[PDB]
Amino acid sequence: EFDAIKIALASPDMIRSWSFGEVKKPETINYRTFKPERDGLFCARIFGPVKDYECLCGKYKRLKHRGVICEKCGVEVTQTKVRRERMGHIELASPTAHIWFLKSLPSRIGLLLDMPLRDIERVLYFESYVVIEGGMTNLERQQILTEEQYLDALEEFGDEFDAKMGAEAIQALLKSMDLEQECEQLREELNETNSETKRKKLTKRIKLLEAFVQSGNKPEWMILTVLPVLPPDLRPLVPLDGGRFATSDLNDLYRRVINRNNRLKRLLDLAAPDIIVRNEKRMLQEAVDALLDNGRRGRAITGSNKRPLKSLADMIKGKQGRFRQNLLGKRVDYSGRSVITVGPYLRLHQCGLPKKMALELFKPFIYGKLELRGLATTIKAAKKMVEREEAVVWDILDEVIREHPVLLNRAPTLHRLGIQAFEPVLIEGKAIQLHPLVCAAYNADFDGDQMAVHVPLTLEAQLEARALMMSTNNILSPANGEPIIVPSQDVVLGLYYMTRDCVNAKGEGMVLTGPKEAERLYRSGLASLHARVKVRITEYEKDANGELVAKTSLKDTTVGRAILWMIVPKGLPYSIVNQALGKKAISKMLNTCYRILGLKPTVIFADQIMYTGFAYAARSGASVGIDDMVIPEKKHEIISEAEAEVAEIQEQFQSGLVTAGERYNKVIDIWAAANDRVSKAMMDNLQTETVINRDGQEEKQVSFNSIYMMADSGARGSAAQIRQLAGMRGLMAKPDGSIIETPITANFREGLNVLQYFISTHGARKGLADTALKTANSGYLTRRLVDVAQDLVVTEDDCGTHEGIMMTPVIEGGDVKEPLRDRVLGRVTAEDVLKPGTADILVPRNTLLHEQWCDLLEENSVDAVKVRSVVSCDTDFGVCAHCYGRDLARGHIINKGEAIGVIAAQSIGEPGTQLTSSIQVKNKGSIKLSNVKSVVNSSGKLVITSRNTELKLIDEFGRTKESYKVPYGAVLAKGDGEQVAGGETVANWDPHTMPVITEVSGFVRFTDMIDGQTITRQTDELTGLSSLVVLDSAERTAGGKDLRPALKIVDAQGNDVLIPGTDMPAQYFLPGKAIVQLEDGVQISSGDTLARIPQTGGLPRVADLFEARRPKEPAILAEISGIVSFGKETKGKRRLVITPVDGSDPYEEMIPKWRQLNVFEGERVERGDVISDGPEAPHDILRLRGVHAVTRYIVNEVQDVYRLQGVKINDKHIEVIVRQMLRKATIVNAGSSDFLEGEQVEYSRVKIANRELEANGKVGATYSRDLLGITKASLATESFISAASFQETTRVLTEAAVAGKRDELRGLKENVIVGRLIPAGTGYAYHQDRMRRRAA
Amino acid sequence: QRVLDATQLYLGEIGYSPLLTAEEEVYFARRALRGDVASRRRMIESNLRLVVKIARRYGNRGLALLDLIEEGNLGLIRAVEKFDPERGFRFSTYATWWIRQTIERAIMNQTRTIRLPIHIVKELNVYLRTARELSHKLDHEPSAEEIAEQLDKPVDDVSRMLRLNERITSVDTPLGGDSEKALLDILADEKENGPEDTTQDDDMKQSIVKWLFELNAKQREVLARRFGLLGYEAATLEDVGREIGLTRERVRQIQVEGLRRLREILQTQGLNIEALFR
Amino acid sequence: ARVTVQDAVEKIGNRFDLVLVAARRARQMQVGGKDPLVPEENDKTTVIALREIEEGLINNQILDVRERQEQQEQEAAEL
Amino acid sequence: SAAVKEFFGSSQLSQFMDQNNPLSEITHKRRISALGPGGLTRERAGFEV
Amino acid sequence: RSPGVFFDSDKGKTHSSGKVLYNARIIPYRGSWLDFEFDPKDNLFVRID
DNA sequence: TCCCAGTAATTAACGAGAGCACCGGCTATGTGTTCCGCTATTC
DNA sequence: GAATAGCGGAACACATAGCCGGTGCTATACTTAACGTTAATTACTGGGA
Ligand SMILES: [Mg+2]
Ligand SMILES: [Zn+2]
Ligand SMILES: [Zn+2]
């Protein structure tokens, strides 16, 4: 039907071509009759008749007389829905400027004319004349004149010069403007200029003019002459009940514009004096400029209720516009909602639907069936059958519901498990029964949470909900490979209670001939559910290619663990239920069943687990009484001791030995010690409190206390809510975040007093307000993340690259945070990962790493796996299925089509409501200082002459478990490559003394080290050594600024000690604030200290990492590898001369002199190493160290926010957001291609344009990749609708409309808006068919 | 450099003409009424401050201030058009009538979204003035009955004219205070049938056509042209008398016969008068 | 008589060619130009289509062959 | 009359009595709200108030 | 908030150096406001409404 | 002569639940005709 | 069955009157209007190297 949406400027003759008549009167309707009035804003000759096939006179009234324009009324009889699609046009008496091309801040009339906006609005408001082609007889073209200046210029020049005023002047400017010659002049001036601000200005002006030439528009269509009106049924005048009416607010603004246009017409026709017609044009132009937008140009005009009226631009912008209220999400028929309940008898693809909702939703199906059975031959009878709800309309409903999935959905829909499908089961009720295993996915509680239902009508949708959205299909989360249907809180406590043993129950020691005699014993009450019993089990391994092999045995186990074993299917080993089987141990059974057996005997397994866990927590009778909180007996003693210590420290502080800040952390110390000692002294009282006796004395064991079995088993509890029921509940905070000294020392069993309850209420009103504001932030975060990742769709099967990032386990200073195996589980390789016997490839180059290739790496202990990643995929407009990886909520590779962008946006969006001196080796390995120069000190050990100094603890197998980073200048107690023990302080340094240590030895001299100008006399007054210390350059005189104290070394034989290896001299020009203790002419050694120099949020950290904001103290880096120096030092700027060994020297950089520098002004720095310290922007990381460094920086710096809160997220979901941030890449040199120099074209298009040019004989383009934040990389998009259905719309429509932009409908929001199939899943093959048949 | 709003620029502008004396006004009108346009320009250009002074009083009605000023300007142009200096009067007394009346007609015209005429608005203002004077006599709101008492006019007339003072509401204002629900969410499209009534009509049409073809031809042609149903026009019994069957009484007879057959055919499907008409 | 479509996905890959093939087959059976191959168990046409996929006697190749053969047979009715 | 009825009829603080208890009536009358005229709104109420 | 003088500080960054800038504010029950804010260069700046 | 820092504007901040003359032109309004329909009489 | 006559009466149209509805006119003189964020970003503009 249509391929593309084109937007452009609308001429004053296009507007006369849409329109069906000129709205000449302000009046809307008649008042006695409610007839539309000829010819105002609701007419009928203009916009069409009010009743279907009926004139206004009514003399023609039929479909038989269709189409004929009447004679008494001029009203063309048609349907009456033509009033939604017929516009009228107002003829403005003077032109008025359009407010979008004037006030949207990069103002198009402004930067098109190169006239500043203040001078334009001083013309439009008739204040100042502006020349229009007066020539350079005396004046400039776009020079404004004030009134008296105009008057004397008119006295000197009556002729040969013309200066108009107002919108006629601006229109004479625009239609007098030439485009090609002015574009040539600006192109030559851009060629000649060198200032980059003016270069960017001319680039913007050139690009605007070039888009104006390439689009078919002219510049003067920015000035409205013929104003089009909306059709009437888009701004209705619906009668309310009682002779009352209600208008959309557009009728008022249109009435205002028509009124001022009529009055201006009559003011010209009366030949008014010019002050009144200038006031009248000022008054229109504004009535218009309000209609088009209210609040922009000054203050908005308001209605009777002291509220501004809703203009045209208000019906598009924001949450109340069409774009995100009526067009993206719509209200939907065949729907309904209710409260939800449990109903735990369901199988997990079923749901409870009431007989009243299901009779209502399935209405037209019951009509279509009651016509089929002959029970009602029409629809007027089939309606009244289901109206009175006969006995036979309830048998029809059980047919039309039988295999028709419904679509349950909770209200804060976060991820794709928030909408699932269920074959419904009819309930006599009013609530929605819903399986217990799926409330973990929905995050649904039965505290009154409501869920909406939906009906897939069409035959494709009943299959879509069964193959993709059914509950038995979604058992793994899309965010990571963890299962999602885990047993939640009651079933797991029941399964904990069953799988236990006590030391002496009934029937202990009897032998059992199967897991069924275990049921017969327990149901007859002859043995307890916890009795250590020799049963014989029969477990099946599938060791061969699917061969279930029996092997009976004789396992020492319980009567509970043997009863439970009959629920476990065939292939699982028996040692998965031969434990206490808490919450964690269940989800690692319902995952091994999914891996070993498959999908179907895991979906049948989770129902049996739930049915058994409920039934055996029923018979458990597991209550909670007030005696189940055993308050420890040593709590009183501990609290008495810690109350003696605080009074002692309080006496000492009054004795002046300690200050308030020293007793503060000494009282908080003793209370945080006693708060631990209480909680540790009660845990030996909770869990071991069962001390029972088998045939003898006593045996302690794990307790059958009820509050221990609800926290040990993981079923709704922890060790931190306990210690607030029996132990003391510790220290509390205050609204400053400061911790209160005197803690609250009563458990919830003993009750709180008034003051302890008041103290521990800021902690609750701080936590509740946190979740109040947290959801408001986390909604907006995933709103941005979805729209930055729309059009990413798995489009190929292999892009064919060998690039891709390199993976390493996360060794963050101490232990391994996340190992290599869990980072590269399910991601194909880019190189052949081979064993450290490096003549043999262990894995092939493009294998998909599932577990069976993970374990071959885990045995051969590989540390670095090069992997294929999304951000290195060479697919234009999409991501190849290899480069993405595994399906992650399906075990196989990703299916071609499946839109990873949205599912990787939601997996970062939905956890967002859960957010806010010496180095010691602590293991056994070998010391590895990596890639760092380091000299032998005067003590013979190793002192550090490197900035990026990295300590590794290489194990006996060549891997690292402990990595470290060493600062500059640290003495090494050990050596490299040799095994050391644990607890070894291997390196040591002062965190304050910065050594400026040498590398050569011999007699040092104080060359260029003089007093009075460079150094001062502040000797060691405490010991008696002549310390020759240096002042700073801010305090010393200007004769010794660049003259720095160097350390040149000679010998006593007249020769000079220089740098060995090279021919360069060995001197070290010390900067200011240098404290030298040595002397001149005395011998120095290698590695001797020359001069002793002195020195987040959870959610907003993610929201600023994805936004890529500039941190306030950027780490200034080394922009080019080479030697470093200091140029001419300005007042606050030290022009850091970075001289390469071969390249261009004069890159100097003004460094704020007050910032603490790091490099010692003479070091050959590698490119992209630090000059100062601080958090770095990802813009600098990208420009210096490339794409693969920023894609590691972001996925490290955001996994260190998610793992801190214990949220696991696979890293591909962050790699695709990184990939969608750098889609734009500005050009450096255009080359032979058709680009400009400083323009920012998108990298996908330049990846094709020079691709065919290098495929041709020509040269390519040199382009630097560019990073944008997700509020900008989503707003700099090719498709102007997926950027306008977002934040600012008046910017994007205006910028696109002056550019003649043309959406191609390739993303997903655009195809959602326009109403066709998205190009993602089921609708992918149809779009492939369309794009194949088109261009063919 | 003036701050560029329309009111400040205008009110600063209008002072650039010295106010005219009486002999000055008379001489300018003598030059003006014989067709010298400069005199008209001077007379209208000077007395703009009179228009701002007069239209100052008409503020805070439905029109904004500059609308009132510009509509007074039209009457001022009318006033210099029809001023007479031969009465010897000062110009302000004669122009005050024209400016005051052409702002009064402006507020009567361009205020209400549904335009009431002049005489209806004057009649409503008579009643509102009566209610304002009646409220101090009984210290409550005077009823429609009370105004009809005090003016001795019929109660239905005063009720109608007060109901024509409805103060037509907006749609876009939210309801209930919370800004989530305006009248667009409350109002239902009443003329457009939904799919249920729209499929009942089509099923009823096809059922009618099926039952008519179930009836014999001579009856159904009479019943087709009789109501314009089966692709025909709704004809008279006299018309189909001259067109098909010459005895008009027999056309009535075959019509009653076809109606009885269709009554039987409808009731065989269980559709009785209670079924189709509740 | 259907809970998991997993074996159908084992036959027809990609999880989406399944839905398009089963939609085309259930359009054949609903708009009653056809009849089911495997017997119905009073299942809706959707589930008979999925059980036909699961036996492997319906896929896109079988459907295209049968539609081309049907058009050949319809062209053989000109006479 | 328009001013005082506009306050008592529909202000921010002129609310319906949530009349489905005795308790609900009392704790509606003894309410200390910080919204309304001369008071802040929910959108710009920082973590301090 | 009670009308009268109100010597709030700033206590945020708001400077890119972390200096605090104290500002008085004179709220009446009815009338125009009045501040006296400090500037980062230790300039004292009035502002009215 | 170009960089640069303070200043002002713009964008965003979850989901679903007076008063009279005067005229003219429309329209209600008698009213005729008329036309249709219905009934009733008679061959 | 079929012609003819009476007759209600519905209504439709036509011609009129009448009355809504728009317009013009008024003559001491009169002369310049109506009280918070929060953060980020970007365009602008006065000021410095
Ligand atoms: Mg809940
Ligand atoms: Zn008509
Ligand atoms: Zn690829």
Alpha-helical (H) ranges within A619-738 are 635-654, 660-686
User: Is strand F within 7 Å of residue D29 (CB)?
Assistant: no
Give contacts of A 81-100 with B, CB under 8 A: 81
Expressed in angstroms and rounded, the spacing between residue A1266 Cα and the centre of ligand 3 is 21
Whose C1' is closest to the CA of A296: which nucleotide?
Answer: F10
Chains C and D touch (3+ CB pairs under 8 A): no
Which of the nucleotides in strand G have any atom less than 7 Å away from a protein CB atom?
1-4, 20-23, 25-45, 49
* Preceding-residue numbers of gaps in chain D (C–N over 2.5 Å): none
SS3 A245: strand
CA A1011 to centroid of chain Cα atoms: 58
Looking at the DSSP assignment, which residues form a beta bridge with residue A409?
A419, A452
- Characterise B235 by phi-psi region: left (phi > 0), alpha (psi -120 to 50), beta (else): beta
Domain ranges for chain C, please list them.
1-79
Whose C1' is closest to the CA of A1272: which nucleotide?
Answer: G41
Topology of the domain comprising A633-765: Topoisomerase I; Chain A, domain 4 (1.10.132)
Output the six-digit token pair for A275.
């002050």
Strand order through the sheet with A223-229: A19-22, A87-97, A223-229
CA B118 to centroid of chain Cα atoms: 13
Among chain A residues 20 through 79, which have CB within 7 angstroms of nucleic chain F?
33
Candidate from A251, A275, A380 with C-beta closest to B13: A275
Residue A1315 is classified by DSSP as T
Chain C interface includes A886 (CB < 8 A) = no
- Within 10 angstroms of residue A649's Cβ, the number of other Cβ atoms is 19
C-alpha distances in angstroms, A524 versus A505, A536, B17? 15, 20, 115
SS3 A1110: coil
Looking at the DSSP assignment, which residues form a beta bridge with residue A639?
none
SS3 C74: helix
Chain B interface includes A198 (CB < 8 A) = no
Which residues of chain A lie closer than 8 angstroms to B32, CB-CB? none
C-alpha distances in angstroms, A596 versus A274, A410, A437, A588, A961? 91, 33, 21, 12, 31
Interface of A with D (CB under 8 A): 735, 766, 769, 773
Give CA–CA dist A572/A597, Å, rounded: 8
User: Is strand F within 7 Å of residue A1274 (CB)?
Assistant: no
User: Is strand F within 7 Å of residue A1289 (CB)?
Assistant: yes
| C-beta separation of A529 from A522 below 8 A | yes
Q: If you search the block for the tokens 């205070």, which residue do you land on?
A: B177
Q: Which residues of A529-549 are buried (b: 16+ CB within 10 A; e: fewer)?
A: bbbbbebebebbeeeeeeeee
Distance of C1' in G43 from CA in A122, Å:
18
With 0-12 CB in 10 A as exposed, 13-18 as middle and 19+ as buried, what is A1234? Answer: exposed
- Within 10 angstroms of residue A376's Cβ, the number of other Cβ atoms is 23
Query: Half-sphere exposure of residue A238, counting CA atoms within 13 Å on the CB side?
Result: 18
| C-beta separation of A607 from A347 below 8 A | yes
Expressed in angstroms and rounded, the spacing between residue B66 Cα and the centre of ligand 3 is 66
- Characterise B266 by phi-psi region: left (phi > 0), alpha (psi -120 to 50), beta (else): alpha
Cβ neighbors of A435 (< 8 A, separation 6 or more) are A343, A344, A346, A347, A348, A350, A351, A422, A471
| C-alpha distance from A259 to closest chain C C-alpha (Å) | 59
Looking at the DSSP assignment, which residues form a beta bridge with residue A692?
A699
Strand order through the sheet with A555-558: A511-512, A532-535, A555-558
Which residues of chain A lie closer than 8 angstroms to B169, CB-CB? 240, 244-247
Q: CA dihedral in degrees (A261, A267, A269, A274; nearest 10)? A: -120
Give contacts of B 123-162 with A, CB under 8 A: none
Give CA–CA dist A1131/A15, Å, rounded: 62
Cβ neighbors of A1054 (< 8 A, separation 6 or more) are none
| C-beta separation of A803 from A872 below 8 A | yes
**Contact yes or no for C42 and A463 at CB 8 A:** no
Give CA–CA dist A10/A223, Å, rounded: 10
- Within 10 angstroms of residue A308's Cβ, the number of other Cβ atoms is 17
Which residues of chain A lie closer than 8 angstroms to C2, CB-CB? 403, 466
Output the six-digit token pair for B81.
């058009």
Domain C1-79 top-level CATH class = alpha beta
Q: Can the peptide bond before residue A1200 be classed as cis, meaning omega within 30 degrees of 0?
A: no
Give CA–CA dist A944/A1086, Å, rounded: 11
Give contacts of A 444-483 with C, CB under 8 A: 459-460, 462-464, 466-468, 470, 472-473
Whose C1' is closest to the CA of D44: which nucleotide?
Answer: G37
Give CA–CA dist A75/A68, Å, rounded: 8
Which residues of chain C lie closer than 8 angstroms to A349, CB-CB? 3
Give contacts of B 103-122 with A, CB under 8 A: 110, 113-117, 120
| C-beta separation of A1097 from A1053 below 8 A | no
For residue A451, the ligand closest to its alpha carbon is 1
User: Is strand F within 7 Å of residue A1135 (CB)?
Assistant: no
Chains A and B touch (3+ CB pairs under 8 A): yes
Output the six-digit token pair for A315.
């019906």
**C-alpha dihedral sign at A1172, A1178, A1184, A1190:** positive
User: Is strand F within 7 Å of residue A1134 (CB)?
Assistant: no
**Contact yes or no for C9 and A470 at CB 8 A:** no
Output the six-digit token pair for A349.
């693809």
Contact partners of E by the rule of 3+ C-beta pairs under 8 A? Answer: none
For residue A800, the ligand closest to its alpha carbon is 3
For A422, the enclosing helix (H) or strand (E) is strand A419-427
* DSSP per-residue codes, E12-40: S--SSS-----EEEEE-SSS---EEEE-T
Distance of C1' in G25 from CA in A267, Å:
21
**Contact yes or no for A377 and B6 at CB 8 A:** no
Give CA–CA dist A1106/A1267, Å, rounded: 11
Q: What's phi and psi for A469, nearest 5 deg?
A: -115, 5
Which of the nucleotides in strand F have any atom less than 7 Å away from a protein CB atom?
2-4, 6-7, 9-19, 27, 35-40
Q: What's phi and psi for B243, nearest 5 deg?
A: -90, -45
Expressed in angstroms and rounded, the spacing between residue A878 Cα and the centre of ligand 3 is 9
Chain A interface includes B269 (CB < 8 A) = yes
Output the six-digit token pair for A40.
């105002």
Give CA–CA dist A592/A580, Å, rounded: 17
**Contact yes or no for A896 and C4 at CB 8 A:** no
| C-beta separation of A951 from A987 below 8 A | yes
Direct distance between the N- and C-terminal alpha carbons of chain D, in angstroms, rounded to an integer: 35
User: Is strand F within 7 Å of residue A17 (CB)?
Assistant: no
Please name which of A863, A884, A808, A825 lies closest in space to residue A1192, comparing C-alpha atoms.
Answer: A808
| C-beta separation of A887 from A803 below 8 A | no
Q: CA dihedral in degrees (A677, A680, A682, A685; nearest 10)? A: -130
User: Is strand F within 7 Å of residue B249 (CB)?
Assistant: yes
- Characterise A1018 by phi-psi region: left (phi > 0), alpha (psi -120 to 50), beta (else): beta
Determine the residue type at B80. V
Alpha-helical (H) ranges within A389-509 are 393-400, 439-442, 459-467, 491-498
User: Is strand F within 7 Å of residue A724 (CB)?
Assistant: no
Cβ neighbors of A206 (< 8 A, separation 6 or more) are A183, A186, A187, A190, A1236
Distance of C1' in G43 from CA in A142, Å:
21
Chain B interface includes A390 (CB < 8 A) = no
Q: If you search the block for the tokens 């939904």, which residue do you land on?
A: B194
Please give the protein residue whose CA is closest to the C1' of the nucleotide F16: A411
- Within 10 angstroms of residue A1208's Cβ, the number of other Cβ atoms is 15
Long-range CB contact pairs, A518-526, < 8 A, 24+: A518/A559, A518/A562, A518/A563, A519/A563, A519/A566, A521/A559, A522/A559, A522/A560, A522/A563
Give CA–CA dist A369/A1309, Å, rounded: 37
Please name which of A72, A18, A13 lies closest in space to residue A47, comparing C-alpha atoms.
Answer: A18
Searching chain B, which residue's CA lies closest to the CA of residue A265? B74
Q: What angle (nearest 5°) sits at the alpha carbon of residue A514, between those of residues A511 and A518?
A: 75
Chain A interface includes D16 (CB < 8 A) = no
Searching chain B, which residue's CA lies closest to the CA of residue A258? B110
**Contact yes or no for A463 and C2 at CB 8 A:** no
Distance of C1' in G19 from CA in B162, Å:
22
C-alpha distances in angstroms, A1011 versus A765, A1024, A1029, A1030, A1036? 63, 19, 9, 8, 10
Give CA–CA dist C38/C19, Å, rounded: 19
Output the six-digit token pair for A6.
């084109």
Cβ neighbors of A654 (< 8 A, separation 6 or more) are none
The resolution in Å comes to 3.3
Chain A interface includes B185 (CB < 8 A) = no
| C-beta separation of A23 from A90 below 8 A | yes
Determine the residue type at A104. S
C-alpha distances in angstroms, E15 versus A974, A1112, E12, E21? 47, 11, 8, 9
Give CA–CA dist A400/C45, Å, rounded: 12
Output the six-digit token pair for E41.
């260069």
Output the six-digit token pair for A924.
């056994």
Give contacts of A 127-166 with B, CB under 8 A: 127
- In chain D, how many H helices and how many E strands? 2, 0
Whose C1' is closest to the CA of B126: which nucleotide?
Answer: F18
3-state secondary structure A1155-1198: CCECCCCCCEECCCCECECCCCCHHHHHHHHCHHHHHHHHHHHH
